[PDB]
């Protein structure tokens, strides 16, 4: 019964109270790898249409994310961009904002990264403000899909670090809309798990309440944008299974610029579209003659290996006889590891293919499964 | 799902059951055979209303005494939603064995 | 100034390399072909002290690793370095670091055709070339992650002398390797040796990577061909032009027939090119039942007045 | 609705406005479809997504939300009203909104209705401050005093509909009829002054509930449940993915536009290995200063074509004055909205739209002619 | 004093009315602001018709604000007397009896906000009385608060709710919670065969 | 200027609605 200051000295010396270190570790990595021990072919949406939808608000100035969440939003929506240009570049991406009350397209729906970038860059400059409204946003998304073809998917995405959302009509008729239009709908939100967006994805994405993702720090949001990236499964009773006719353009060579079909600027590169033989100036685009989706080999090439994915490389049991001292693929010497003389032999680094026997390490393993999407063990096998 | 405690066959209408709902018909089922007064809270969250329901249901119609239930609540509001749960759960015991067995449950409130 | 790690993917197939030999009008053209090798390996530790090589042979029954030799080397009978089992194959008064990488290249491809030799009985119908540079770029990423930078470049030592054609099962990783060097910034330079002019998917390699394709026919003076054009380090490749004079067009060939495809039709669901609309009206990859309205609107006519 | 593709092809007025913002798409009109003939609805048949976004820029609108609680002054103190919020308070208050029908047009300005409004405890009532009796309000505004209690009796009564028995706290005082305990306390009932009328702070909760509730149902427009509200769907099954899966066969056919056996590779690999044995000369490879000469030519015009392709790859500057430019690209321009509409309705396949497709034809030949 | 202005920005205000019609259109109200994500507060009575009958599950309570403890009228002769008769006959102390029903109707204010395991929602309680009261809990509702949550202000309140929401919006693991938060058929029928 | 692009454009519209009434 008696004031703090008269107690005791905090004691904050005596405070801290103190090989088998590599276990405590390695069961930490089986625990993580053992939700991606399922893996299956799921056919996925390939020619895709996504809707970026921002958040622009005064919950965007808050102190949470560094420096404020705007522009780390907007920075990651630029490396966003990137990658899934890099990754599907078959793709038509349109990017939107909500500010103001008012969801304000910022760019048109487009194979171009540039002007998209661009777009992003010139909004990182304005000051996010204004209370958000999602129904504004599906509806603009809704008309911007709706010269979407059936082969192409519908997606939009959007980043909604708000918890209300104040709309000028009901939200429920703009889901029913979307889920009759067949567009399917990631949300991404900041803070926490929004009920109506919970609706949004369960509803739109066919009972699946996986689509709706709340970060807990700074890299996992990076996860979330890269996880984005990927093309989603489409499911079964979708039958959208169309054939898309599209021509192979050449690059044209020629020391005099000349006018190209989309701009109408003089470009001394270009690729001639084979069905009416005009000129543009990027690639993957549409060529603006004939209506023509010009390509490239390495487009398609860029989305072969999300149909072909690898199975994961199980790693071998340390007490069964290893193949080889060294890796398969960069001949690295595999660790003999052990921990102690009674400690024994444990977490063997080798990481055995199933389709082909052959052992690989931990670097080898985390470069063919994402970097590369072939298994060498699995090609020098002479069928 | 259909389960036996002791010789009661349990028609739960969920294909899971919470422990705590288990261990909680546990409790009831020895009460009932014991017979006398009991207070026992089971958390919310857990369902609490269509445990109970299917408890009694299956005391009645599996028992050859074939004692009626009674069921007082505080509100027609929390009735209402003990009405709505016993239609599941006579819904699921309709679908389970085949057939509407011989059942009559109603609420009851005043005039307005 | 900055060094670079020079990745070499070699392709040895006995019916390849014979029918080339056959076909000129010498015998034994990979000697030539071989010490012109060594010499470029010498010529490219000559470039910089802390660059380093790597070789790697694309055999028939799989692959092997020639340089650096594998870490089963343990100063043992089974050692089979240095001066274990030295056979005297170059000469003693070589510059030591290149005499060790030399000597060592040279034992591993005596060995490696002598493990050939005794498999000789089994011809295989799979080319483990694409395999081959994917673990490549595998011990590339490893010497680029090991070491903090360094650059990196690949050479592949291809044949075709006019006996194996473009093969189909060589689409897929060969674009898995263009992705790959195309992160890590790697330039991928392909010579061929052969009569067969054109090689498309490697052609697209070369271009899409930054990389320099030369086609040679001759298996005489290759050391011109290798250190005139192939010496590009990435240091000094943006300020140097490459005389990859031929221009390949990026196209692919259709699925059910097999020719270079011109504007076209694909599968919305397994996205490989048919020239032609499948019999049917079914895919022949992943077998989609296709809509029959749309397929009415691509063999819809064209209209013109009468 | 007004967003299908008929609707955005026939408002004139909507493209007349974007004529009016936009600059590059107004010029391609002034020089496509006014000077060589092309219809305007082949010109809008490429546009309709420019239409669509140019016409929900402005189409919608903003959420309700309670725009008086927003309002705060700031002697002088001032208020800041922008048009938006003269809106809002219209949309979300009729009563200020009839007030201004009848007292601007007639009597007095804006200004001055707005300020009288601010000035008035009809104000007060509608942000929800308790009434006082000591403001002298604005006498004109205080007119609307009686018609704003008919507006909130008319709202009571529009808005009043039965509940479902989930959440009838209506039928929760009335579940025994007969019920006659021991009444509430001053605590569990509304205050009252000293004679035992209200303080009228239970007329501010209802007025604020009922804007709550207006604003609600202002969302009900053109713009069994219990059974599964009672669901618990924690104790049901997890929801099973029915995504498709693909078999893909790598079966394809070989690109189309020597045999030699065993014995001759054991042969030649001999040779190759007793080579290997005996000696390599490395000075070997050096050319025969003949072949070198040869390679160094077919090398150096390589890159003499490749310097030339490369050395020339924002538009680049031209030799041609800015007028005959300019003229040059607006010709290109119009050759490729000409091609783009004759390709579109020659791959549309109509024998109705043949007309058309003539019209182009002779519109791309006289364009032929114009080149 | 401008508190309920800024209040209207962020959730619509919802207050309980001694009409029930009202109240009950007020109660659908806001369940209606809850579900499209307008968001939405409701204030209410402890002792009323809303704390009775009426469930707050899922997104209909997510924070349940206890303004102080739902003390009576302890002046009202009627509670007096009801003290000095449970006190006279069974022996039940008068501060027992009126903190037992204080918070037996907290107690019942709090458990309307969950249904199902999946649900989620904090009961905070906000006055200087609840810290000596843990003990009178409810078991299920005692065994979670925790020590360090007994005497706590605003902001760290505010944090470990900002970081509980943040925590629960993450997609659980069904390994985690396949055996012993729910069971199955066979894991009900491999924990009979353990008890017998 | 622009200005007689517009006098020109809503007179040829004027001229449009002559001709469609
Ligand atoms: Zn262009
Ligand atoms: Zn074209
Ligand atoms: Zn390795
Ligand atoms: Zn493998
Ligand atoms: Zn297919």
């Given at each position: 019964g008696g004031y703090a200051w008269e107690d005791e000295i905090k004691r904050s010396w005596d405070l801290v109270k103190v090989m088998a270190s590599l276990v405590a570790s390695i069961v930490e990595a089986r625990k993580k790898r053992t939700a991606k021990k399922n893996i299956t072919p799921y056919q996925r949406g390939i020619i895709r249409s996504l809707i970026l939808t921002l958040d622009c608000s005064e919950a965007m100035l808050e102190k949470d994310l560094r420096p404020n969440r705007h522009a780390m939003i907007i920075q990651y929506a630029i490396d966003f961009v990137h990658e899934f240009f890099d990754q599907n570049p078959i793709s038509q991406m349109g990017i939107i904002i909500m500010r103001n009350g008012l969801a304000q397209l910022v760019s048109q729906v487009s194979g171009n990264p540039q002007d998209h970038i661009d777009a992003l860059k010139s909004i990182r400059k304005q000051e996010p403000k204004g209370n958000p409204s999602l129904q504004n946003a599906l509806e603009m998304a809704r008309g911007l899909l709706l010269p979407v073809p059936a082969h192409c998917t519908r997606e939009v995405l959007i980043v909604f670090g708000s918890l209300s959302t104040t709309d000028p009509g009901d939200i429920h008729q703009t889901i029913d809309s979307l889920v009759s239009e067949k567009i399917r709908v990631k949300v991404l939100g900041l803070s926490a798990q929004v009920a109506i967006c919970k609706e949004l994805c369960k509803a739109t994405n066919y009972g699946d309440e996986s689509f709706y993702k709340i970060l807990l720090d700074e890299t996992h949001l990076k996860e979330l944008f890269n996880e984005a990236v990927t093309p989603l499964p489409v499911n079964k009773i979708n039958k959208g299974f169309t054939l898309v006719k599209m021509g192979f353009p050449t690059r044209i060579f020629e020391d005099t610029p000349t006018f190209c079909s989309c701009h109408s600027k003089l470009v001394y590169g270009g690729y001639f579209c084979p069905n009416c033989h005009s000129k543009v100036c990027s690639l993957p685009t549409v060529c603006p003659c004939?209506?023509?989706?010009?390509?490239?080999?390495?487009?398609?090439?860029?989305?072969?290996?999300?149909?072909?994915?690898?199975?994961?490389?199980?790693?071998?049991?340390?007490?069964?006889?290893?193949?080889?001292?060294?890796?398969?693929?960069?001949?690295?010497?595999?660790?003999?590891?052990?921990?102690?003389?009674?400690?024994?032999?444990?977490?063997?680094?080798?990481?055995?293919?199933?389709?082909?026997?052959?052992?690989?390490?931990?670097?080898?393993?985390?470069?063919?499964?994402?970097?590369?999407?072939?298994?060498?063990?699995?090609?020098?096998?002479?069928? | 799902?259909?389960?036996?405690?002791?010789?009661?066959?349990?028609?739960?209408?969920?294909?899971?059951?919470?422990?705590?709902?288990?261990?909680?018909?546990?409790?009831?089922?020895?009460?009932?055979?014991?017979?006398?007064?009991?207070?026992?809270?089971?958390?919310?969250?857990?369902?609490?209303?269509?445990?109970?329901?299917?408890?009694?249901?299956?005391?009645?119609?599996?028992?050859?005494?074939?004692?009626?239930?009674?069921?007082?609540?505080?509100?027609?509001?929390?009735?209402?939603?003990?009405?709505?749960?016993?239609?599941?759960?006579?819904?699921?015991?309709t679908k389970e064995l085949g057939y509407q067995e011989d059942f009559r449950g109603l609420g009851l409130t005043s005039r307005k | 100034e900055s060094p670079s790690l020079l990745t070499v993917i070699i392709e040895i197939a006995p019916k390849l390399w014979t029918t080339f030999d056959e076909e000129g009008n010498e015998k034994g053209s990979i000697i030539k072909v071989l010490e012109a090798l060594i010499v470029f390996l010498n010529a490219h530790l000559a470039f910089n002290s802390a660059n380093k090589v790597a070789v790697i042979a694309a055999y028939s029954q799989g692959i092997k690793y020639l340089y650096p030799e594998s870490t089963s080397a343990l100063k043992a009978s089974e050692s089979e370095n240095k001066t274990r089992s030295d056979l005297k194959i170059i000469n003693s008064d070589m510059y030591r670091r290149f005499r060790n990488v030399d000597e060592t290249?040279?034992?591993?491809?005596?060995?490696?055709?002598?493990?050939?030799?005794?498999?000789?009985?089994?011809?295989?119908?799979?080319?483990?070339?694409?395999?081959?540079?994917?673990?490549?770029?595998?011990?590339?990423?490893?010497?680029?992650?090991?070491?903090?930078?360094?650059?990196?470049?690949?050479?592949?030592?291809?044949?075709?002398?006019?006996?194996?054609?473009?093969?189909?099962?060589?689409?897929?990783?060969?674009?898995?390797?263009?992705?790959?060097?195309?992160?890590?910034?790697?330039?991928?330079?392909?010579?061929?040796?052969?009569?067969?002019?054109?090689?498309?998917?490697?052609?697209?390699?070369?271009?899409?990577?930054?990389?320099?394709?030369?086609?040679?026919?001759?298996?005489?003076?290759?050391?011109?061909?290798?250190?005139?054009?192939?010496?590009?380090?990435?240091?000094?490749?943006?300020?140097?032009?490459?005389?990859?004079?031929?221009?390949?067009?990026?196209?692919?060939?259709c699925y059910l027939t097999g020719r270079v495809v011109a504007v076209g039709f694909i599968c919305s669901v397994c996205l490989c090119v048919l020239s032609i609309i499948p019999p049917g009206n079914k895919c022949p990859a992943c077998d989609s039942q296709f809509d029959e309205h749309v397929i009415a609107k691509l063999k819809r006519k064209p209209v013109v007045p009468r | 609705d007004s967003?299908?593709?008929?609707?955005?092809?026939?408002?004139?007025?909507?493209?007349?406005?974007?004529?009016?913002?936009?600059?590059?798409?107004?010029?391609?009109?002034?020089?496509?479809?006014?000077?060589?003939?092309?219809?305007?609805?082949?010109?809008?048949?490429?546009?309709?997504?420019?239409?669509?976004?140019?016409?929900?820029?402005?189409?919608?609108?903003?959420?309700?939300?309670?725009?008086?609680?927003?309002?705060?002054?700031?002697?002088?103190?001032?208020?800041?009203?922008?048009?938006?919020?003269?809106?809002?308070?219209?949309?979300?208050?009729?009563?200020?909104?009839?007030?201004?029908?009848?007292?601007?047009?007639?009597?007095?300005?804006?200004?001055?209705?707005?300020?009288?409004?601010?000035?008035?405890?009809?104000?007060?009532k509608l942000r929800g401050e308790k009434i006082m009796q000591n403001d002298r309000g604005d006498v004109i505004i205080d007119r609307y005093l009686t018609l704003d209690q008919e507006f909130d009796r008319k709202d009571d009564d529009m808005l009043l509909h039965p509940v479902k028995k989930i959440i009838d706290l209506d039928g929760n005082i009335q579940d025994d009829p007969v019920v006659r305990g021991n009444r509430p306390d001053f605590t569990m009932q509304p205050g009252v002054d000293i004679n035992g009328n209200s303080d009228g702070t239970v007329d501010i909760l209802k007025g604020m509930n009922r804007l709550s509730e207006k604003m609600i149902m202002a969302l009900k427009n053109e713009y069994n449940d219990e059974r599964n509200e009672l669901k618990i769907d924690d104790l049901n099954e997890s929801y099973k993915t029915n995504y498709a899966i693909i078999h893909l066969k790598r079966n394809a056919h070989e690109k189309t536009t020597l045999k030699v056996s065993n014995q001759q590779m054991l042969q030649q690999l001999s040779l190759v290995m007793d080579n290997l044995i005996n000696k390599l000369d490395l000075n070997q490879v050096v050319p025969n200063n003949e072949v070198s000469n040869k390679i160094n030519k077919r090398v150096i015009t390589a890159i003499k074509i490749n310097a030339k392709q490369a050395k020339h790859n924002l538009e680049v500057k031209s030799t041609l004055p800015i007028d005959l430019l300019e003229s040059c690209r607006m010709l290109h321009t119009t050759c490729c909205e000409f091609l783009k509409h004759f390709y579109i309705h020659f791959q549309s396949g109509e024998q109705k739209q043949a007309s058309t497709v003539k019209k182009l034809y002779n519109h791309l030949k006289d364009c032929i002619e114009k080149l | 004093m401008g508190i309920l202005d800024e209040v209207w920005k962020h959730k619509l205000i919802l207050v309980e009315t001694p009409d029930a019609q009202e109240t009950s259109l007020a109660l659908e109200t806001y369940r209606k602001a809850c579900s499209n994500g307008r968001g939405a507060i409701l204030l209410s009575v402890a002792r009323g018709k809303v704390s009775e009958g009426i469930d707050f599950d899922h997104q209909y309570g997510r924070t349940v604000l206890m303004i102080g403890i739902p003390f009576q009228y302890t002046e009202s002769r009627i509670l007096k007397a009801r003290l000095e008769f449970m006190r006279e006959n069974y022996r039940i102390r008068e501060n027992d009896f009126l903190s037992f029903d204080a918070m037996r109707h907290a107690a019942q204010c709090l458990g309307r906000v969950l249904r199902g395991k999946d649900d989620y929602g904090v009961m905070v309680l906000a006055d200087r009385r609840f810290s000596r009261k843990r003990s009178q809990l409810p078991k299920w509702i005692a065994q979670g608060l925790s020590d360090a949550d007994l005497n706590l202000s605003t902001d760290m309140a505010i944090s470990n709710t900002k970081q509980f929401l943040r925590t629960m919006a993450q997609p659980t693991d069904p390994k985690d919670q396949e055996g012993v938060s729910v069971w199955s058929y066979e894991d009900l029928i491999k924990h009979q065969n353990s008890r017998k | 200027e622009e200005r007689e692009n517009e006098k020109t454009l809503n007179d040829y519209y004027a001229a449009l609605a002559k001709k469609q009434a």
């Open positions: 004939c209506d023509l989706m010009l390509i490239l080999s390495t487009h398609l090439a860029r989305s072969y290996h999300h149909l072909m994915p690898l199975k994961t490389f199980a790693e071998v049991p340390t007490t069964e006889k290893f193949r080889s001292e060294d890796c398969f693929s960069c001949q690295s010497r595999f660790p003999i590891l052990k921990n102690h003389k009674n400690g024994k032999l444990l977490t063997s680094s080798r990481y055995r293919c199933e389709d082909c026997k052959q052992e690989f390490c931990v670097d080898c393993d985390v470069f063919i499964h994402e970097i590369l999407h072939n298994c060498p063990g699995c090609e020098s096998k002479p069928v | 799902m259909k389960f036996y405690i002791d010789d009661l066959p349990v028609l739960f209408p969920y294909p899971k059951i919470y422990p705590e709902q288990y261990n909680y018909m546990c409790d009831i089922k020895k009460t009932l055979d014991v017979g006398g007064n009991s207070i026992l809270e089971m958390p919310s969250g857990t369902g609490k209303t269509v445990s109970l329901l299917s408890l009694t249901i299956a005391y009645q119609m599996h028992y050859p005494e074939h004692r009626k239930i009674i069921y007082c609540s505080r509100t027609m509001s929390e009735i209402e939603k003990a009405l709505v749960e016993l239609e599941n759960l006579m819904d699921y015991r | 290249l040279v034992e591993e491809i005596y060995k490696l055709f002598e493990l050939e030799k005794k498999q000789i009985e089994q011809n295989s119908q799979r080319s483990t070339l694409a395999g081959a540079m994917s673990a490549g770029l595998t011990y590339v990423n490893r010497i680029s992650k090991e070491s903090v930078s360094l650059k990196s470049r690949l050479l592949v030592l291809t044949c075709g002398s006019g006996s194996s054609k473009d093969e189909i099962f060589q689409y897929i990783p060969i674009m898995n390797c263009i992705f790959s060097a195309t992160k890590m910034k790697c330039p991928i330079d392909v010579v061929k040796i052969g009569g067969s002019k054109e090689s498309t998917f490697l052609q697209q390699t070369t271009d899409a990577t930054n990389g320099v394709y030369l086609h040679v026919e001759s298996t005489e003076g290759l050391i011109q061909y290798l250190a005139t054009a192939m010496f590009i380090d990435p240091s000094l490749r943006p300020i140097i032009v490459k005389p990859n004079h031929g221009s390949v067009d990026f196209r692919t060939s | 967003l299908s593709k008929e609707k955005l092809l026939t408002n004139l007025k909507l493209q007349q406005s974007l004529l009016k913002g936009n600059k590059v798409l107004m010029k391609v009109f002034q020089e496509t479809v006014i000077n060589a003939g092309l219809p305007p609805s082949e010109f809008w048949s490429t546009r309709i997504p420019l239409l669509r976004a140019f016409a929900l820029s402005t189409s919608q609108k903003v959420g309700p939300y309670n725009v008086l609680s927003t309002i705060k002054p700031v002697n002088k103190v001032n208020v800041n009203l922008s048009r938006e919020k003269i809106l809002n308070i219209f949309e979300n208050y009729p009563i200020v909104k009839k007030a201004y029908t009848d007292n601007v047009p007639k009597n007095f300005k804006e200004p001055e209705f707005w300020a009288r409004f601010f000035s008035s405890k009809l104000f007060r | - | -």
